[PDB]
């Protein structure tokens, strides 16, 4: 961190403070202030033309100015020679991660008009025309084309960004190679731990910040869709019944599913430990006739057998919870809507829009169980350095 | 292979010959001969009672007798230490892989009645009742409960199955360690390469055999569903137009997508080559103070940087093709059905059933590419094991 980041003690803190000041000036007052001055309409089209509308273009100017003010503060205070990749570089990655969420809510808002058109078509033959369907696909391809261009440039940029981190650290380590040479375990602390640190930290950083963004974007649309689901199957009418049930079910994908699988990383460590122990007796067996004695290697293999057999049995418990959850998840999204489907309040557009937002919110809490590898791996690497 | 399978030269081939004889006696007659006896039923329920209907469990008897006859031939001729795991163990994995395909077909056939009920409900309020919906989701949980209890026992068995392969190899390499001692890297090949061989070979073995089964199971239903889609969007009426368009689009995940990404495995190798060269230069500089120097390590790292940069640029081409395919695939399944949706010849149930078939068939061709990748990885591992026998022969 000391390399590739200007003073990480006050950086990552002045950034977080500045983010809250900018957000409070936008989402808790203000925001409409600049929008009213410029005369923004305040309406957002479902088409791909939303991304260059006046409402969105205001945010782009605000983001650049706020980052520009933040950059100019650090571009004079403590220059670091990696500013344009450390401060400006990560600002683009945060912004692009937010933009790729707005394309997600754009297609989600597109299912409501598209599938309401399918429902109209199936109810009566030739009530709609074929030319009406093509202009609905032609709108989705506008959003999809934007997502394709931004996503490929996002992965292209972030891959250099993590590589400029290795270039920065190796520049610092090599300049002190005369003292760091004698340290045991080198030539992988500088050759293998540099990438596995930068690559995994960025992966955790974007994934964690993507979870917050996709919850901020998709919880409000669940709330505004909860007006069309007044009642739930078994518990009857409950205020905000849809979002409360959506949150609780989504936690099951990272709660009970993670509780039963918390012992798996512990058992995995023991298996690789006994594998390394088997290696140690095997490597000494090559150089000498003694060691790797056939009575002895039988002991080490009987020790790796039992540790694998215990992992297989414990992973069976995790498989039952995970597989059953996925199978039920195919119909739980539709299960909640049964008292509303029968009542005629929900149309086909909302039924597939509500089903879609369930997956996106589920993919948010997925960034706890699925990212758990990165959270523990970051500390597994930062301790060596 | 010789340490686990009995005479892999013939058994691993005679099994394929025996399968064709058993299949020809089943799918080209004979199956009706044994179904005519005992009456059978002919029809198949959509419920979870599908898997013990008279149509199926006669096939279970046929499978057991055929593998039992095949195994009995190899248990009398050329006996082996790992007979039950190598022959009966492999046969169960093949059968369970087939069974989970029939579970996927069962839920796919369940979409037609369920979604035709949703379409009925949305067209007129209170034309359906809530209890009518609970019965439809009731029969799905019956199939899902069968799926989970067989899938977890499948992974439990196959994980033990690959370990009996590793146990088999070590029992053969040990007691020969006195001759294999002097080979370079013998320790890591007897520990790491003997596990990554069995672990990845089964991944290729089941994925390749899963792709064939899910194509054999889902192409006929796709052809049957093609009667409800007489016309295609642009090309007009085409015989079997749905399945022809489904296959061509599914090959796009193995054609254009694979062609642009063919250079990636080759380009990745050079990256790890230069990176291992960097490690090699560092280790020699760790022992000798004059080996690293401010030059050389600067120059050789510049070869690491200039080689990664060509991977990022080339992977950008693969991203455009892959991401665009996935984005379009969200609506291409519905694009073909547009002239049929407007014509009223299709319902909501068939629209979801046809769309679901596209995903399963697409995953079949996905399984073939992953099978090829696992096979080429296996060759990278099999060469080490093939060469390891230097001293034995
Ligand atoms: C990392 C180090 C460098 C980080 C530099 C950050 C500088 C902060 C600049 C300002 C960012 C916030 C501007 C306003 C954001 C806001 O209001 O929220 C938007 C979403 O918030 C963001 O995307 C901001 C993310 C900031 C994250 C800061 C984290 C700092 C530390 C990260 C460590 C990793 C959505 O607003 P909206 O709904 O009005 O926009 C959409 C609408 O249609 C148009 O109005
Ligand atoms: C190592 C290999 C060990 C032995 C492997 C098995 C050898 C013996 C297999 C004999 C039985 C094979 C199936 C015959 C039945 C048949 O026709 O196949 C059915 C299914 O075919 C299969 O694919 C089943 C699995 C057989 C696969 C055989 C592969 C052998 C080669 C393996 C080589 C190693 C890998 C389809 O029949 P159906 O549609 O009428 O029945 C199903 C229907 O729903 C109700 O009847």
UniProtKB/Swiss-Prot annotation, chain A:
Membrane side Cytoplasmic: residue ranges: 32-55, 108-136, 226-241, 352-385
Reported phenotype of the disruption mutant: Mutants are resistant to proline-rich antimicrobial peptides of eukaryotic origin.
A matching Pfam family: SbmA_BacA
**Topology feature Periplasmic, residues:** 1-10, 77-86, 158-204, 263-330
Topology relative to the lipid bilayer, per the entry, is:
Multi-pass membrane protein
Keyword vocabulary terms for this entry: Cell inner membrane, Cell membrane, Membrane, Peptide transport, Protein transport, Transmembrane, Transmembrane helix, Transport
> Could you name the Gene Ontology cellular component terms for this entry?
plasma membrane
Query: Which GO BP terms sit in this record?
Result: microcin B17 transport; microcin transport; peptide transport; protein transport; response to antibiotic
Residue stretches spanning the membrane? 11-31, 56-76, 87-107, 137-157, 205-225, 242-262, 331-351
Record's subcellular location: Cell inner membrane
Spell out the molecular function terms from Gene Ontology. Answer: ATP binding; microcin transmembrane transporter activity; peptide transmembrane transporter activity; protein homodimerization activity; secondary active transmembrane transporter activity
What is the stated purpose of this protein? Uptake of antimicrobial peptides. Required for the transport of microcin B17 (MccB17), microcin 25 (Mcc25) and proline-rich antimicrobial peptides (such as Cathelicidin-3, Arasin 1 and Dro/Drosocin) into the cell.
Q: Which family does it belong to?
A: Belongs to the peptide uptake permease (PUP) (TC 9.A.18) family.
Q: What is this protein called?
A: Peptide antibiotic transporter SbmA
Q: Which organism is it from?
A: Escherichia coli (strain K12)
């Amino acid at each position: 961190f000391k390399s590739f980041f200007p003073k990480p003690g006050t950086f990552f803190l002045s950034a977080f403070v500045w983010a809250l000041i900018a957000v409070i000036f936008w989402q808790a007052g203000g925001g409409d202030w600049v929008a009213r001055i410029t005369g923004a309409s305040g309406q957002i089209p479902i088409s791909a033309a939303r991304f260059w509308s006046l409402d969105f273009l205001i945010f782009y100017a605000y983001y650049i100015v706020c980052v520009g003010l933040f950059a100019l503060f650090w571009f004079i205070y403590s220059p670091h020679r990696w500013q344009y990749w450390s401060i400006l570089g990560t600002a683009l990655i945060i912004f692009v991660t937010w933009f790729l969420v707005e394309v997600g809510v754009a297609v989600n808002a597109w299912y409501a008009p598209f599938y309401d058109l399918i429902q109209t078509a199936l109810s009566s033959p030739h009530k709609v025309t074929i030319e009406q369907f093509y202009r609905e696909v032609g709108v989705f391809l506008g959003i999809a084309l934007i997502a394709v261009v931004i996503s490929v440039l996002n992965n292209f940029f972030v891959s250099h960004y993590v590589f400029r981190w290795r270039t920065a650290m190796n520049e610092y380590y090599m300049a002190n190679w005369q003292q760091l040479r004698h340290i045991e375990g080198a030539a992988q602390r500088v050759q293998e731990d540099t990438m596995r640190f930068a690559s995994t930290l960025e992966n955790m950083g974007v994934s964690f910040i993507n979870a917050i963004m996709t919850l901020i974007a998709f919880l409000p649309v669940l709330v505004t869709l909860s007006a069309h689901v007044p009642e739930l199957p078994i518990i009857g009418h409950i205020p905000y019944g849809l979002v409360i049930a959506a949150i609780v079910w989504s936690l099951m994908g990272t709660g009970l599913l993670a509780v039963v699988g918390i012992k798996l990383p512990g058992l995995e460590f023991k298996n690789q430990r006994v594998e390394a122990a088997y290696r140690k007796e095997l490597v000494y067996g090559e150089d000498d006739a003694t060691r790797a004695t056939p009575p002895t290697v039988r002991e080490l293999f009987s020790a790796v057998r039992k540790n694998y057999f215990r992992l297989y049995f414990h992973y069976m418990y995790f498989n039952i919870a995970r597989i059953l959850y996925l199978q039920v998840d195919n119909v739980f999204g539709l299960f909640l809507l049964f008292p509303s489907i029968v009542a005629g309040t929900i149309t086909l557009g909302l039924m597939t829009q509500i089903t879609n937002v369930f997956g996106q919110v589920r993919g948010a809490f997925q960034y706890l169980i699925n990212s758990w590898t990165t959270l523990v791996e970051l500390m597994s690497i930062y301790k060596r350095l």
